[PDB]
Amino acid sequence: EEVVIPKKKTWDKVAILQALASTVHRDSTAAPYVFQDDPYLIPTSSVESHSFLLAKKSGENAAKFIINSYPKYFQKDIAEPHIPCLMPEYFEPQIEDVSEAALQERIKLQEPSANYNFQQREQSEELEEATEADNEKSKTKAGTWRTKNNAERIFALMPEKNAHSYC
Amino acid sequence: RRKALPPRTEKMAVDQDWPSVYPVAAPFKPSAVPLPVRMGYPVKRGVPMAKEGNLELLKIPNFLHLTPVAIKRHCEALKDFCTEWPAALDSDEKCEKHFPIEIDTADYVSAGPSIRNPKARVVTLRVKLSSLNLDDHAKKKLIKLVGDRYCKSTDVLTIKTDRCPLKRQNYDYAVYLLTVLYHESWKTEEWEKK
Amino acid sequence: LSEYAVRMSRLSARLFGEVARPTDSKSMKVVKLFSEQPLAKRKETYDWYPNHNTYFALMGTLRFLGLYRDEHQDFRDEQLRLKKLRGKGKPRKGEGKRA
Amino acid sequence: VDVPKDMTKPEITISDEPDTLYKRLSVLVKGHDKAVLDSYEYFAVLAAKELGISIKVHEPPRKIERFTLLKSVHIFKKHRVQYEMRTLYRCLELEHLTGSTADVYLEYIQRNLPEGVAMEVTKTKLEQLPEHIRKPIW
Amino acid sequence: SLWDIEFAKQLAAVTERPFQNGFEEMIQWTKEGKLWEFPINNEAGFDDDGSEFHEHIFLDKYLQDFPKQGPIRHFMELVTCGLSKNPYLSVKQKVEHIEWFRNYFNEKRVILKESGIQLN
Amino acid sequence: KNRAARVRVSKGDKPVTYEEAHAPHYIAHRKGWLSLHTGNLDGEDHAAERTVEDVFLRKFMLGTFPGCLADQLVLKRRANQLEICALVLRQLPPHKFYFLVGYSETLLSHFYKCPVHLHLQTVPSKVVYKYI
Amino acid sequence: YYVDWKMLRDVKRRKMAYEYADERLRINSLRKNTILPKDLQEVADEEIASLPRDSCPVRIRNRCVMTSRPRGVKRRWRLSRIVFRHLADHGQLSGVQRAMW
Amino acid sequence: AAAAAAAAAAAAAAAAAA
Ligand SMILES: [Mg+2]
C-alpha cells in the first residue's frame, strides 16, 4: 500500500538531442556551420559561398567515385553495428545469362536497360506484365523517336495491364 | 589574390550568449573565441604563446560548450524527460523490505568504431536470505548447496553469471538459478536421511 | 567427506551446470577446450596484421590519380630515372646471366 | 532581436509499464590527466544538482603502469629507457534514481564525455521478487 | 513502384539542407546510424538470433542419439558443459559441434566395436 | 647522447616550432600528447587498432596536404567519431581547400567505418617559438 | 606489398590457422581425454598429423606491424621496441610518457 | 558408484528453461 512506483517515459533516439538543440538558437556573428570557421575559408560574398559549397560537394562525390570504382579496398568492416551507408556500392548486375534476372537488375541500375530487353527478346523469353512495367518506368524516368519504338514493344509484344501502361 | 579577414573577436557582442557560439564539442578555433589566452612555457625574455597557431591549445579538451550557463539551459530542457523518485523509499531500511533483490549490471563506453566489450556480459545478483520464506531445514540445505557464494556474516547470497553471451540472457539465467535454488532447497530426498 | 556431503556436492554441480559425475583433472581439459575461444579464433590473433596490400594499393592508386602525393615513391622514381640515364638500369628477365 | 518562434516540439509519451528503479549508479571515469577529470567532476556535480540527484563524489587511488625498454638499437643493455602510463580515477556515486532519470542523466553525461577519458557504468537495478518464488510450495 | 521513389526523392530534395548546427549534424547521423545509440550499451545491434539462456546452457536435448550408459555419455557431458560455459559462440555453432561428434562416431563404427565396449 | 625526437641546435638561425623545441622528457610536463583516445588507459583494450589508424592518418594527411602542413596533426577520438585538427598554411586557394576537406571527410569515413571530422586552422606562416 | 617475406608467410599461417581452428579444436578433444579408449586416440593422432603444417597455431609468430621485427615487440600495441619509442617520443600515443620517480 | 536421478525436464518446464 505504501509502495509508489511511477511510470516510464519512452522517447526516440534523437528526441533528447532535438531538445538540447532547441535550447541553442542561430548565432548572429557566426558563419554558417557547413563552412569552415577560419577567416581564410569563410565565404565573403554570395557567389563565393556558392562556389565553396560546390567545391566541397565536388570533393565528396569525387571520393564517392573512388569508393564505387574500387570496392575491394573498403570491404573490411571495423564498426560492430555494421553501418550500411559506409559500404561501397556496386553498379553491376548479379546475373547475366538469365533473362528473367538481368532485367530486374538493369532496370534499377539507361542504355543497359534497353540492352537487357534486347537480349531477353532474342531468345523468345516470355515477359509478364510486371517485368516490363518497371523497364518502361526506367525509360519514363530518364528519357522522341526511340519512345515510339519502346511503346510498340509495350502493347504489341504483350497484352500488358492498363494500370502499368498509363503510368 | 590573397585575402585576410579579421576574426569574429571584433564582432563579438558583450552580452552575446555563449551556448549559441559553442553548442557542441569544438576543436577550439581561435577565430571563434574572443578570449585572449596564452598557453605554453614562456621564454626567458618572451611570453607564453598566444592563441593563434598554438598547438597546445588545440591538444587539450575544451569545455567551452559546457559553461555553467549552457549547462543550466540544457538541464532545464531535460526536466520533461525525467521522472520523479518516490519519497516512500528515501531510506534503505524500507528498500530492503520492499525490493530486497539487487541486480548489479555493468555498462561500458570506449572511443573507437567498436562497441562489444566482453566485460559487459557479467551480471551480479545479490539477495538477502533474511527476506525469504526458508525454514531451518531448507536454510541449512541452501547454505551448503550454494557454498562460498553466501556470506555468513552479512547474510547475503551472491550469484555471478557470465556463461551467457548477452546481458539479458545472463539476467534471466540468474533469476532461473535463484528460482531453482529456492525450489531445490525445499525438497528432502532419500539420501538426506543419512 | 561424507555420503551426505558428496551427494550435496553432486547436486550443486548439476544445479549450477558444472560437471556432475567425478572426472579427472586431465579430463577437465576437454571441458576447458570448449569453455573458451581457441587461440586461432581470437581477434587479437587472426586480426593481428592489417592488410598492407590494401594500404599500399590504395595509396598507389590515389598517387596515380593525383590525390595523394607519395614523396618516398617520388624519391625512388627520381633515383631510378637518374640510374637509367647514367646507364645502369634493371636488366630484362632472361638475359642477365646468358647474355 | 530575430528570435525564432515555436522552436520546441519534443515527442514524449508516458507508457503504463512501471518504471525500473535503481538504488546505486556508480560511474568510474578514468583518464590520463587530473585537470580534465576535475572539470568533468564540476560539470557532472552541477548537472546532477539541477536534476536533484544528490551525488557524492570521491577519488579512487590512481594506477601507474611502468615498463622498461632498451635505450640503443643494436647492443646496449646497461642503459635503459623507462616509460610510464598514469591512470586517474573519479567516482560519481548516484543514489535514488529511476529508469528514465538515469537514462536522461546518462544522455547528458555521455554525449559530452571528453575524448581522452573512459567511463564504467555499474547499475544496481531494483526488483522486488520473481514470480515462481513469491509464496510457492513446489 | 519507381514513381513512389521519385516522389520521395522530390520530397527529400526540399527536406534536406546543408547543416546549420552540430546538434543537427549528430541528429542526422544518428538517424543514419553513424553515431552510437545513446545511452551506449555494449549489446546494441547484436541479438544472437533472438536466443535465450535455455538455448545456450541446456544442450542435453542434442544428446538423445547416443549410448546413455556408455563412455560416450561421459565424454559428451564434458563437451556439453564446456560449450554451455562458452559466451563466444552462437547456438548454431554448438549444434554443429555436437553434430560433428555425432557423424564422426557414427562413421567410425569398427573401432568402437573393436575396443570391447558395446556402442551404437 | 640522447637523440630521440630532438632537433639539433644550429648556429642560431633555424626556425623551430614549440613541439620540436622540447625534448621527449618534457611530455606531459611542458607539452601534451598529439593524440587522445581510450586504448592507452589501464582497464581498456584495442590500443593497436587505434595506433595503426593513427599512423595511417599522419601519413595520409601529410601526403594529402603537401607542403602546407605547419605542425603535426591533433587526432581526437570521442564517441565513435574521430576529429582531425590541422594547422595549414594559406598556400592553396580556398576552392582547393574545400575540395580536399570534403574529399577526406568521406574517404576516411568510408575507409574506417566511423564518422570523421576535419578541422583546418589557416596560419600565415609557420609560427616560430625559439630562436629564428 | 607487405613489409617482409617473413610477414607474408606469417599472414598465410594465421589465415590457415583460422581456417582450421574448428577442426583442430575438435580433434584435440579426442586426444586430451582419458574416458575414450586409446585405440581411437592413436587414429586421432594420425588425422591430426595429416593436417597441413602451417595450420597449427604454434607456427604463428608475433612480429611488429610496421617493421615486422620478430623480437622485442610489445603485445599491447603490437609494436617493436624501436617504433614504439619513435612514436611515443614524438607524442603520437596518449598517456605514454617518460617514467620519472 | 551410485548415481542420483535429477529431473531436469520437469524443472525446466516448471521455471521456464525448456
Ligand atoms: Mg625490407
CATH number at residue G84: 1.10.287.1480
Q: Could you tell me if residue G32 is inside a domain?
A: yes
Tell me if E80 sits within 8 A of A115, measured CB to CB: no
Rounded to the nearest angstrom, the distance between the alpha carbon of G3 and the centre of ligand 1 is: 6
- In chain G, residues with a C-beta closer than 8 Å to the C-beta of D117 are none
What does the alpha-carbon distance between residue D130 and residue B159 come to, in Å, rounded to a whole number? 15
Q: Which residue has the cell 525436464?
A: H9
Is residue D56 helix, strand or coil? strand
Rounded to the nearest angstrom, the distance between the alpha carbon of G65 and the centre of ligand 1 is: 13
What does the alpha-carbon distance between residue B20 and residue A29 come to, in Å, rounded to a whole number? 10
Q: Which residue has the cell 546494441?
A: E44
Q: How far is CA A57 from the centre of its chain?
A: 16
**CB neighbour list of residue C9: distance below 8 Å, 6 or more residues apart:** none
- In chain G, residues with a C-beta closer than 8 Å to the C-beta of C38 are 21, 24-25, 57
Terminal-residue alpha carbon distance, chain E? 59
Q: Do chains C and F touch (3 or more CB pairs under 8 A)?
A: yes
Distance, in angstroms, between F68 CA and closest chain C CA?
A: 13
Is residue C16 helix, strand or coil? helix
Which chain E residue has the Cα nearest residue H18?
A: E54
Q: How far is CA D134 from CA B100, C60, F58, G76, in A?
A: 12, 69, 62, 49
DSSP chain A: -----PEEEE--TTHHHHHHHHHS---SSSPPTTS-SSTTTS--SHHHHHHHHHHHHHHHHHHHHHHHH-GGGG-----TT--STTSPP--S-S-SS-HHHHHHHHHH--HHHHHHHHHHTTTT----TTHHHHHHHHHHHH--HHHHHHHHHHHTSS---HHHHH-
Q: Could you tell me if residue G36 is inside a domain?
A: yes
Which chain A residue has the Cα nearest residue F53?
A: A78
Q: Could you tell me if residue G2 is inside a domain?
A: yes
Which chain E residue has the Cα nearest residue C42?
A: E88
Elucidation technique: cryo-EM
Taking an 8 Å cut-off on Cβ atoms, the answer to whether B49 and F127 are in contact is yes
Tell me if F131 sits within 8 A of F12, measured CB to CB: yes
- In chain H, residues with a C-beta closer than 8 Å to the C-beta of B191 are 4
Taking an 8 Å cut-off on Cβ atoms, the answer to whether A79 and B3 are in contact is no
Q: Could you tell me if residue G3 is inside a domain?
A: yes
Which chain C residue has the Cα nearest residue G54?
A: C40
Q: Could you tell me if residue G62 is inside a domain?
A: yes
Range of the domain at G14: 1-91
> Beta strands D21-31 and D13-18: pairing type?
unpaired
C-alpha grid cell, residue B53: 597557431
With both helix axes pointing from N to C terminus, report the angle between F94-112 and A46-69 in degrees, rounded to the nearest 10.
Answer: 30
Q: How far is CA A64 from CA A53, A57, A88, F112, in A?
A: 17, 11, 8, 14
- List residues of B whose CB lies inside 8 A of any E CB: 23-26, 107-109, 115-118, 120-121, 162-170, 172-173, 176
With both helix axes pointing from N to C terminus, report the angle between C3-16 and B136-146 in degrees, rounded to the nearest 10.
Answer: 70
DSSP chain H: -------HHHHHHHTT--
- In chain C, residues with a C-beta closer than 8 Å to the C-beta of B157 are none
Q: Could you tell me if residue G58 is inside a domain?
A: yes
Terminal-residue alpha carbon distance, chain D? 73
- Which of D7, D111, D120 is the best residue to mutate to test the E interface, defined by the most E CB atoms within 10 Å of its own CB? D111
What does the alpha-carbon distance between residue G12 and residue B153 come to, in Å, rounded to a whole number? 57
What does the alpha-carbon distance between residue C87 and residue F67 come to, in Å, rounded to a whole number? 33
Q: How far is CA C93 from CA C76, C89, C96, in A?
A: 21, 13, 7
**Phi then psi for D3, rounded to 5 degrees?**
-105, 125
Taking an 8 Å cut-off on Cβ atoms, the answer to whether F115 and E35 are in contact is yes
Q: How many CA atoms, within 13 angstroms, populate the side-chain half-sphere of residue G79?
A: 19
**Phi then psi for D20, rounded to 5 degrees?**
-70, 145
Taking an 8 Å cut-off on Cβ atoms, the answer to whether B86 and A11 are in contact is no
What does the alpha-carbon distance between residue C69 and residue C63 come to, in Å, rounded to a whole number? 5
Q: Do chains H and F touch (3 or more CB pairs under 8 A)?
A: no
Residue A77 contacts F where some CB pair is shorter than 8 Å: yes
What does the alpha-carbon distance between residue D24 and residue D26 come to, in Å, rounded to a whole number? 6
Tell me if D135 sits within 8 A of D50, measured CB to CB: no
Q: Could you tell me if residue G100 is inside a domain?
A: no
Looking at this protein, which amino acid is placed at residue B43?
A: V
- In chain A, residues with a C-beta closer than 8 Å to the C-beta of C58 are 70, 73
Residue F119 contacts D where some CB pair is shorter than 8 Å: no
- In chain A, residues with a C-beta closer than 8 Å to the C-beta of D16 are 7
- In chain D, residues with a C-beta closer than 8 Å to the C-beta of B75 are 47, 50-51, 108
**Partner residues linked to B94 by β-bridges:** none
What does the alpha-carbon distance between residue A37 and residue A31 come to, in Å, rounded to a whole number? 6
CA-nearest of F96, B57, B194 to A52 is F96
C-alpha grid cell, residue C41: 579464433
Q: Which residue has the cell 563565393?
A: A48
Residues making up chain A, counted from first to last: 167
Residue B83 contacts D where some CB pair is shorter than 8 Å: yes
Total domain count for chain G? 1
User: A with E: how many residue pairs have Cβ under 8 Å apart?
Assistant: 59
Task: Please name the chains neighbouring H, where neighbouring means 3+ C-beta pairs under 8 angstroms.
Answer: B, C, E
User: Quick one: CA torsion of D45, D48, D52, D54, rounded to 10 degrees?
Assistant: -40
Neighbours of C76 (CB within 10 A): 11
Tell me if B3 sits within 8 A of B46, measured CB to CB: no
Instruction: Identify the burial level of D53 via C-beta atoms within 10 angstroms of its C-beta, where 0-12 means exposed, 13-18 middle and 19 or more buried.
Output: buried
What does the alpha-carbon distance between residue A128 and residue F84 come to, in Å, rounded to a whole number? 55
Q: Could you tell me if residue G101 is inside a domain?
A: no
Q: Which residue has the cell 593525383?
A: C66
- In chain B, residues with a C-beta closer than 8 Å to the C-beta of F119 are 27, 29
- In degrees, to the nearest 5, what angle opens at C-alpha B176 toward C-alphas B173 and B179? 155
Rounded to the nearest angstrom, the distance between the alpha carbon of F66 and the centre of ligand 1 is: 26
